[PDB]
């Protein structure tokens, strides 16, 4: 289940109590833990199995206490075992452990001195970002234009990895400044205020760079976005199961009864399903592509639905002809769309040449009638040659 | 089928031993009957997961032991015990149940280095699942050195009191009926190798012309010990051999095959070829596999030897041409557990089986034929037994086959080969008296 790290004298837990009690409205068995009130190290593993499903880190400074509770390598080892992480930063409080751990994930937050500044007076007392800058669906999609408060914040430079899922953008006219005479950290629209990250084991992380965002004094602007952001962070909003990835002949027989062959008619069928936290619903989607593949791909065919069930929408590919190239081909569906869950289904099959019997026959072909007629003529003339040769008298 | 009544447990010990890679219990009960119709039976309750993997079930009297009729049936499932000398309805009796299992537990750190101790996790009951009411019941966990509980309860009672190489506790009074109230999990050090095979087929070959019996065994053994982290490195293994003395550790380097008394022609082969690292000393056949079998690794091999037939076969008294064979049901290493055994005995070509007796309750039996060398007619009589769950140390038994083999069918082997040679040479005569000259 969930876990809360926090501390007093920087950001108390009382001014977050609207959201955690929302997690109490679900079946999340929360388990708090307090820096500057607890000296025991978190038994995050007893021997080899994982106690907590989730972790939530409220803003703090990471001098010695945070490295006592969770170091970087223990957090890597927690995140590879489907351990969902929600982490927060601010220019008033940059932890060092979380900054290095995010640097391992290709997310580069701004350090202690650097603060983001937006002019043009959006609110002119604190920074605030409208809902135009939400880059990705499947985490939150705004039905109408609204504002999201960000009191003092810090942006992140992002590496170009596949796994990183951007969620919100800096408002394109902002920058960073420090008290020291250092260079600017990020440009206008290249900094990202909140950043998601999805593991290859389908574990998720959300770095969210403001202490004034999730507070109890802000439900008038960022109430639904934080609730569905926390729906996305823990695997509850958008995950995908792929149930039956089966291929067979076009007339219904399987690979087991008759193995495949060059220039053959097959069918392929995979079905997807998503999960809104309560029910496995059928997954409506374009963009799903079959690949028939050697070292290089021989087929990329987009999948039409052609099917339905109570908790699964299937997808077909139509009757397609196998290549005349012999070899060991793999049947691949990598559904890899950022924002929602990665799935891979592959089945490696051998596809052989034609047998010596399974050729166009000599009487079937229009060109070989001459030679069948001439071989039959030589044979019948040979039989009359031996009977005529024996029955004559020399 | 639930038992009604008429047995009440005064004393109830339960001693689990965990020391040789199969769990053995020695329950000791002292029962009292109630004033009713005097009934003569008993029901021992097992869980549905333990009843699937059980290999031996026996009962004694405690005064002086003879045996009792202990029958195992075929969702708590039972096993009946039948008493001779039907008991008066108010009298104390004494009783000993022994049982031997198949499971041993899970390695609780599943990855561990080869120079490190392993610890296993076993799950069981603490309050005894008895079909009847108990008045006093003590538990005793004998076995290896270090025992530790897993998720200890908040109650100070029902907690383990450690003794010298023992772990003694238990709910001691007034347990009403079937009690699945709490499931125990205990971790313990265990330095046996945990050899277990998955499929043993062993083929023996009776032979009246050679007067010899010929054993051939195919072992498919795994090591269910803890797997090793950071992979396998020959440097750490070879330095671990060169440091000292090869104490007791996990992996398999040598196997001690305990054969019958006079065994003559020993061989030990893999699938790919033969293996030369084997040493056949008197009564003992030592074996070194090609690679040391660490935790989770597979190894399938074949051993074989040759005994004379004069000590496994015995001519009957009423007829000269009726033979009775008693075959050792199991030969192997001293610490192994057999998940499947199929014992194929092969009688000669004209033998006809009359009677079959086995001391261990088999799963299956059938009679087929199989053609070996110079089986021109139907072939050898393959009498094959299928046993499921066996222990190397426990299942001491011999299979008794009573068949006949008359001299009318004893001399049909050279007469059949003589029939092929004769019809081949008359075939030569037809192909040399025949005129083809155009």
């Amino acid at each position: 289940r969930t876990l809360v790290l926090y501390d007093q004298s920087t950001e108390p837990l009382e001014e977050y109590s609207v959201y955690l009690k929302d997690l109490e409205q679900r079946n999340y068995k929360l388990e708090y833990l307090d820096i500057n009130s607890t000296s025991t190290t978190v038994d995050l593993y007893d021997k080899e199995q994982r106690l907590f499903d989730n972790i939530i880190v409220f803003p703090t400074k990471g001098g010695k206490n945070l490295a006592r509770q969770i170091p970087v390598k223990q957090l890597i080892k927690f995140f590879e075992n489907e351990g969902n992480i929600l982490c927060m930063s601010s220019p008033g409080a940059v932890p060092n452990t979380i900054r290095l751990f995010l640097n391992e994930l290709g997310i580069y937050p701004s350090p202690k001195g650097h603060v983001i500044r937006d002019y043009f007076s959006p609110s002119s007392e604190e920074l605030v970002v409208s809902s135009n800058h939400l880059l990705n669906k499947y985490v939150y999609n705004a039905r109408k234009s609204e504002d999201f408060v960000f009191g003092e914040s810090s942006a992140a430079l992002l590496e170009n990895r596949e796994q990183i899922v951007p969620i919100l953008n800096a408002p394109r006219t902002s920058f960073t400044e420090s008290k020291g005479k250092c260079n600017s950290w990020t440009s206008g629209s290249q900094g990202f205020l909140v950043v998601g990250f999805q593991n290859l084991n389908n574990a998720r992380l959300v770095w969210i760079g403001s202490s004034d965002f999730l507070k109890n004094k802000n439900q008038d602007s960022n109430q639904e976005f934080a609730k569905e952001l926390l729906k996305w962070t823990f695997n509850e909003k958008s995950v995908i199961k792929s149930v039956h990835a089966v291929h067979s002949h076009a007339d219904g027989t399987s690979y087991d009864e008759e193995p495949y062959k060059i220039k053959d008619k097959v069918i392929y069928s995979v079905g997807f399903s998503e999960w809104n936290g309560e029910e496995w619903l059928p997954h409506i989607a374009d963009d799903i592509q079959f690949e028939l593949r050697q070292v290089d791909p021989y087929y990329r065919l987009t999948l039409s639905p052609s099917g339905n069930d109570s908790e699964t929408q299937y997808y077909t590919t139509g009757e397609f002809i196998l290549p005349d190239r012999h070899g060991v081909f793999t049947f691949l569906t990598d559904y890899r769309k950022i924002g929602l869950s990665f799935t891979t289904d592959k089945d490696v099959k051998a596809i052989r040449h034609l047998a010596n019997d399974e050729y166009p026959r000599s009487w079937e072909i229009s060109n070989s009638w001459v030679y069948i007629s001439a071989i039959c003529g030589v044979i019948v003339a040979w039989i009359f040659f031996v009977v005529s040769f024996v029955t004559t008298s020399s | 089928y639930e038992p009604p009544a008429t047995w009440e447990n005064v004393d109830y010990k339960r001693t689990i031993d965990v020391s040789n890679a199969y769990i053995s219990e020695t329950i000791e009960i002292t029962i009292k009957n109630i004033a009713s119709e005097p009934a003569t039976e008993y029901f021992t309750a097992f869980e549905s997961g333990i009843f699937s993997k059980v290999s031996f079930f026996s009962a004694y009297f405690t005064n002086e032991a003879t045996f009792l009729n202990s029958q195992l049936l075929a969702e708590i499932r039972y096993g009946i015990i039948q008493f001779p000398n039907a008991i008066s309805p108010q009298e104390e009796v004494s009783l000993v149940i022994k049982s031997f299992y198949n499971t041993v537990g899970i390695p609780y750190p599943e990855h561990v280095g080869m120079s490190e101790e392993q610890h296993l996790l076993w799950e069981t009951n603490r309050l005894p699942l008895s079909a009847y009411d108990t008045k006093k019941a003590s538990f005793t966990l004998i076995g290896s050195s270090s025992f530790e509980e897993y998720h200890p309860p908040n109650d100070e009672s029902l907690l383990g009191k450690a003794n010298g190489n023992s772990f003694e506790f238990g709910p001691w009074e007034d347990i009403p009926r079937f009690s699945s109230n709490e499931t125990l999990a205990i971790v313990y050090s265990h330095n046996a190798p945990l050899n277990q095979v998955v499929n043993l087929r062993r083929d023996i070959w009776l032979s009246h012309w050679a007067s010899t019996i010929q054993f051939e065994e195919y072992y498919e053994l795994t090591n269910k010990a803890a797997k090793l982290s950071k992979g396998f490195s020959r440097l750490e293994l070879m330095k671990q051999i060169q440091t000292q003395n090869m104490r007791q550790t996990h992996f398999v380097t040598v196997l001690d095959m305990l054969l019958p008394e006079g065994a003559t022609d020993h061989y030990f082969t893999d699938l790919v070829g033969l293996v030369s690292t084997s040493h056949a000393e008197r009564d003992h056949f030592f074996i070194r596999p090609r690679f040391p079998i660490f935790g989770g690794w597979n190894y399938n091999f074949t051993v074989g030897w040759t005994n004379k037939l004069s000590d496994f076969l015995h001519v009957s008294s009423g007829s000269d041409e009726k033979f009775v064979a008693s075959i050792p049901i199991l030969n192997g290493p001293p610490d192994t557990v057999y998940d499947n055994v199929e014992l194929s005995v092969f009688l000669p070509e004209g033998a006809e089986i009359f009677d079959i007796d086995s001391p261990v309750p088999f799963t299956n039996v059938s009679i087929e034929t199989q053609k070996s060398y110079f089986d021109l007619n139907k072939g050898h009589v393959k009498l094959t037994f299928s046993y499921r769950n066996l222990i190397s140390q426990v299942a001491n038994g011999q299979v008794l086959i009573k068949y006949d083999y008359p001299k009318s069918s004893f001399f049909k082997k050279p007469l059949s080969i003589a029939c092929y040679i004769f019809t081949a040479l008359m075939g030569v005569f037809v192909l040399k008296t025949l005129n083809m000259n155009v």
């Binding site: 390598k73 890597i76 995140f79 590879e80 060092n96 290095l100 640097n103 391992e104 994930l105 290709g106 580069y108 350090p111 430079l157 992002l158 590496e159 170009n160 990895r161 596949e162 796994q163 951007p166 260079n183 950290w185 290249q190 593991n199 290859l200 084991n201 574990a203 | 992979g231 396998f232 490195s233 020959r234 440097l235 690679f291």
Partner: protein
């Protein structure tokens, strides 16, 4: 004669078997990392770096597509 300061470490493969006289070595391609970083950076992460010394710098990574 070779020395342990030779033979640089192997960060993409790991040995699974090596025979008794060290003839036939059997290696395995260990799977690519879950967080997407290269395996030599995992190797230089898990050892030898860097004496509890740090540096904070503009990472010079270009721009995200």
């Amino acid at each position: 004669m070779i020395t342990p300061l030779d033979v640089p470490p192997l960060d993409y493969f790991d040995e699974v078997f090596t025979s008794e006289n060290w003839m036939v070595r059997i290696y395995q391609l260990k799977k690519d990392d879950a967080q997407g970083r290269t395996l030599r950076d995992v190797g230089e992460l898990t050892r030898s770096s860097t004496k509890t010394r740090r540096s904070i710098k503009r990472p010079e990574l270009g721009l995200r597509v």
